[PDB]
Amino acid sequence: DNYRCPNPGDAFECFESDATARFCVSGKRGAYVICSKCRRKYEFCANGAKVSKRPEVECRADWASTECTSENSDVPSVMK
Amino acid sequence: YRCPNPGDAFECFESDATARFCVSGKRGAYVICSKCRRKYEFCANGAKVSKRPEVECRADWASTECTSENSDVPSVMK
């Protein structure tokens, strides 16, 4: 892969530099808010989700104040 | 990493036992605790982590108390 995305079943190796960063991403499973840069890269690789150009539209007007939980933050050690 | 075949051991190393997940599959949408239980739900019930947890489960799905019912995983896949 061009973006260095792992193939399904391979290791997901990402060094986190901003865990509390919120991102409204939009891909194959819809648009939703995630937390951390590693989760943002995981969403790009697993669901083709890119960072939304209209976050207020796709997610919520208060998408940046979303609480970071294990559900919207964690990345699997292995690409699903 | 694959789901075990029926009769095979469900062997999973837990890294976040208290993590809550609203999952939605063949038996509906409900809150489970732990990454190993989340993988079990995917293998047994085709349950994937919900993109609308407040919709599918509850607005307070993340405050759900973790119990043996919503956390435990069978040792052998059926």
Residue A1 burial class via C-beta count within 10 angstroms: exposed 0-12, middle 13-18, buried 19 and up: exposed
Q: How many Å apart are CA B32 and CA B39, to the nearest integer? A: 11
Chain A touched by B51 (CB under 8 Å): yes
Chain B touched by A32 (CB under 8 Å): yes
| H-state helical runs in A1-80 | 37-47, 55-58, 70-73
Q: Which chain B residue shows the shortest CA-CA distance from A34?
A: B51
Inter-chain residue contact A29 with B20, CB threshold 8 Å: no
Experimental method: X-ray
Inter-chain residue contact A71 with B15, CB threshold 8 Å: no
What's the alpha-carbon Rg for chain B, to the nearest Å?
12
First to last CA, chain B: 18
Residue B78 burial class via C-beta count within 10 angstroms: exposed 0-12, middle 13-18, buried 19 and up: exposed
Q: How far is A2 from chain B (nearest CA, A)?
A: 23
Task: Determine contact, residues A19/A68, Cβ cutoff 8 Å.
Answer: yes
Q: How many Å apart are CA B52 and CA A20, to the nearest integer? A: 20
Question: Of B69, B66, B74, which is closest to residue B34 (Cα–Cα)?
Answer: B66
Q: How many Å apart are CA A52 and CA B39, to the nearest integer? A: 29
Task: Determine contact, residues B63/B70, Cβ cutoff 8 Å.
Answer: no
Where in A1-80 does DSSP place strands (E)? 22-27, 30-35, 50-51
